[PDB]
Design an enzyme around this catalytic site. Structure first.
Site, PDB file in Angstrom:
ATOM      1  N   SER B  45       0.841  -1.190   0.000  1.00 23.50           N
ATOM      2  CA  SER B  45       0.000   0.000   0.000  1.00 23.50           C
ATOM      3  C   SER B  45       0.874   1.238   0.000  1.00 23.50           C
ATOM      4  CB  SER B  45      -0.908   0.028   1.233  1.00 23.50           C
ATOM      5  OG  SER B  45      -1.800  -1.071   1.199  1.00 23.50           O
ATOM      6  N   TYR B 108     -12.819  -3.349  -5.012  1.00 21.11           N
ATOM      7  CA  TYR B 108     -13.969  -2.589  -5.549  1.00 21.11           C
ATOM      8  C   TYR B 108     -15.266  -3.359  -5.246  1.00 21.11           C
ATOM      9  CZ  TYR B 108     -16.988   0.087  -8.569  1.00 21.11           C
ATOM     10  OH  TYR B 108     -18.026   0.853  -9.047  1.00 21.11           O
ATOM     11  N   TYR B 134      -3.245 -10.479   2.331  1.00 19.99           N
ATOM     12  CA  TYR B 134      -3.147  -9.114   2.800  1.00 19.99           C
ATOM     13  C   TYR B 134      -4.558  -8.626   3.165  1.00 19.99           C
ATOM     14  CZ  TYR B 134      -1.526  -4.140   2.612  1.00 19.99           C
ATOM     15  OH  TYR B 134      -1.247  -2.810   2.858  1.00 19.99           O
TER      16      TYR B 134
END
Lengths: 298, 298, 298, 298
Positions: B45, B108, B134
């Protein structure tokens, strides 16, 4: 700084017909005072404050205060949804000889900020006792944000602390920096066992947590160890407190789990609980046992 | 047990026009290896994986792997929303010489459980590398529950760990009990700095966290101290890590904050970030400085 | 007022090997134009924009625009997480002859307000085409609030509308009052079939919704009926649209469900979908059938 | 099918010193009966049930029942956090001559499913009156899911309906299909004004909503129009109800807003509200006024 250290949210022992169990509740109180706790908190969440009517809470507070007989500071939880009832109960707490009240934000309507500040100011103005805020967003649906707690401490000199009940290092840390940075003797206690050590290391003040009922030696000795500077010993006790909250998963509400743990740890009290809590089943009672055993607590 | 210890999610240093900064990202990598970290995680990230196109991530992974030159284990983050892209990138990670991949759930659409298990199985089957899940619910809107992680580890022998990115002791503890109880050498790393010490004490495996970029000595020495049995020293380092995540409040995304902290801590790299992140302003840069200074990190 | 009326988020037909199905996608487009829709929206959520790489989306947009051949206005969905990719795709949409773009907020990082406004401004400045915002909080984890949509319309004259994807009369109504009260020709479309009628009656502009693929007559005739003043007839059609969204519960992602419904309603196209979506099972296909039948749509 | 049609959650009129206003509450009741409503619901959310002590709610229920004098069916809201208090109040409702009770799920502790089913069964077994569930997740933090409402209707013959308080077509539609498909005469009422028309068109039964206090003609006429088959006229009224809930944004709690609207619409009652609600300010009172005027309701 008021109400620091280990202050358990004491369980209210009931008889099978749902009346206050005076002998049992008294023995519990005496164990905890003997264990070296720094205060006692009656009619918290674990105390089943929200399954009880007003008059019953009065009776329980009065009894609890009497039995403690000023040996340690007493906190009465006086909150709820009925604001007038909060005032009534808060003043009664005062007349009955409490050292302070613990007030949660109203939890049905999630109240406008203006109204929330207004509410906490009004209840703070109804007494001359020190007043502890109670955050528990998981149940209230409305978080007492550090900023807003700082607005309340800024407004009223008798708003002098908070029990912060949340599984979050960020909320604890932010609470400490925002509020204690502005008000150094404002008290910050965490509501969960596994956050005590962290709360101390962040510059906070202690814990009000369920393990204080059946295992207060662990939190008391952690605090003592930390105060003596022996961090190693303190982190050792912390290791147990990290594990303890698995049991709270056994039921919801877990008020029954706590009482059953009191028994299994050597104090034979009635484990009756007020609906809509219910008796823990024998399988889960047994699972609670192996857990307490695993951790060297019985 | 694979990928244990301190494994930083390394920042991808960019030029002003947004291309990979090979000299800078190389110097960063070398500092961290020199600091004694136990592995490196590129295109996490913080690595800005989600602002980058596929071909760019390939280029960055390849370069990163090559520069590391097997001195420590390398993890490539290959996830996203495009499943075929995840496979492509995952196989490329393999060909390019990565030691493992780190795969987040698609973020999403919140994927039906059947599809989520299907997705992770398909990616796992596309490589012979070890695969790290993750979890980052705050950003994904879908939590990888301990139960479900246990279903995945049960299904595929190459699903051998997790970076758990959540401010929650309960999720970390439950993750360790459910998954490591069933799979003792399955790796559990926390995604936040303030949870490392706790993660260790709960029977977990380490941390992948941002402070590894600009202050890896703290996490590396904590780990070393804990491994040597010196808990006191380890909790001391923990005290700094408890404070560090204040800075991540300065912006969102805080990818810029991390880079600026690298510079302030002695490594002069371009702090360019890919939109929709933006340059941190001078006021907040200055506030970051006083923070790092306060904690004895620059 | 741009892009009013019934504008379907068209499905991208893929072959069994996962390539754009030009004959199928072309037939679908021609059915909808023939049904009397007011525009077409390619690479929406239902278009599988987020399971596709950049180059593929370009190819699909170009093909789609070319096949439409200006018979109706075309909208290309160009959003995602990668801001630079959003600009690239948006400009390409322009070069390729699109009439407008539809841009969702970045959905991995939930971006600071300052950065979100900055992002939408940058994308809006990268084209001269009209730009439609896309709110879908259930999936994004970040709501485009009416206030903020008003700040964006106030900033850029080419931000001229919104597809609001949320099961909420309040958000739709608040969107209309805040934004259209300030900007009367700013377009408000709802993202769900069951909110079209309401959106019209609230002073809004139409719908972009999945039922437009397999049953556009219903939404097209509702709109026509409402425009002719015949509210009764319009509420009749509304009665069907109230029921339709049951089917979207059959899978997640429900992109497969929509394609299967296209077939069952008389247009034989490949129902292949890109992972991590998967083929709908026969039981649920059959359940979809009885549903379409019970509503008189096949 | 019991308690169908328009059943307002009636406001409890208080004097300036906070006592039940018998003349005012009586006039209100008579206006609503005169308006043609299908029943009356006292001590709902809008009735300020949660700011009142037990004895006060009894007094209010008794008075309300007596004044209604069987001219329309009466519902007493008897819920809260204290289960024993719920039974007490429920039985009293029965003795006092109520036609049914309305019971919300306990809203402090979010109760295990086993305990929630157990709670609703126990309160249902404490009376012979028909029992209406009350879902309001925004405030309770725990949703009464269609499946679970079906489990409750399956368990107890006297659980015969629901007021569903949520801005969601999906929950209403799913409630109707799951529960009414299994139990055709089980009643489904929506808790919000803007969902009445939809609730009817979905095969549901009516509304319990605040606009019934100050503007019951609108909902009553909508219902009448729909029942006569004149959908156009019904959607016209619907157009007003779509707008009405703007006013509830003026305060939180909006119990004050409703009372002020009663006055402004021609019934001069004391608008006093129990803390932590507070008097609406003049600016907002005036904004409420323009709104009611805009909609042709005063």
């Amino acid at each position: 700084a008021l109400f620091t250290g280990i202050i358990p949210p004491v369980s209210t022992i009931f008889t099978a017909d749902g009346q206050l169990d005076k002998p049992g509740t008294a023995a519990l109180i005496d164990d905890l005072i003997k264990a070296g706790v720094d205060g006692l908190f009656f009619l918290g969440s674990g105390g089943e404050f929200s399954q009880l009517g007003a008059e019953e809470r009065k009776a329980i507070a009065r009894f609890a205060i009497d039995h403690v007989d000023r040996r340690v500071p007493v906190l009465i939880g006086t909150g709820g949804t009925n604001a007038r009832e909060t005032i009534e109960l808060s003043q009664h707490a005062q007349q009955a000889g409490a050292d302070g009240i613990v007030v949660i934000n109203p939890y049905y309507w999630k109240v406008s900020e203006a109204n929330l500040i207004r509410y906490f100011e009004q209840v703070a103005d109804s007494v001359t006792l020190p007043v502890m805020l109670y955050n528990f967003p998981a149940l209230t649906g409305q978080d007492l944000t550090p900023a807003l707690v700082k607005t309340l401490a800024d407004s009223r000199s008798n708003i002098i602390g908070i029990k912060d009940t949340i599984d979050s290092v960020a909320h604890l840390r932010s609470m400490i920096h925002t509020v204690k940075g502005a008000h150094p003797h404002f008290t910050v206690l965490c509501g969960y066992d596994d956050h005590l050590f962290n709360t101390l290391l962040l510059g906070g003040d202690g814990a009000i947590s369920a393990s204080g009922n059946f295992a207060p030696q662990v939190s008391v000795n952690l605090l003592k160890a930390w105060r003596d500077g022996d961090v190693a010993k303190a982190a050792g006790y912390h290791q147990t407190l990290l594990q303890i909250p698995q049991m709270y998963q056994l039921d919801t509400p877990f008020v029954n789990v706590i009482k059953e743990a009191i028994v299994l740890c050597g104090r034979p009290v009635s484990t009756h609980v007020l609906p809509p809590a219910s008796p823990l089943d024998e399988p889960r009672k047994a699972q609670l046992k192996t857990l307490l055993q695993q951790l060297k607590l019985c």
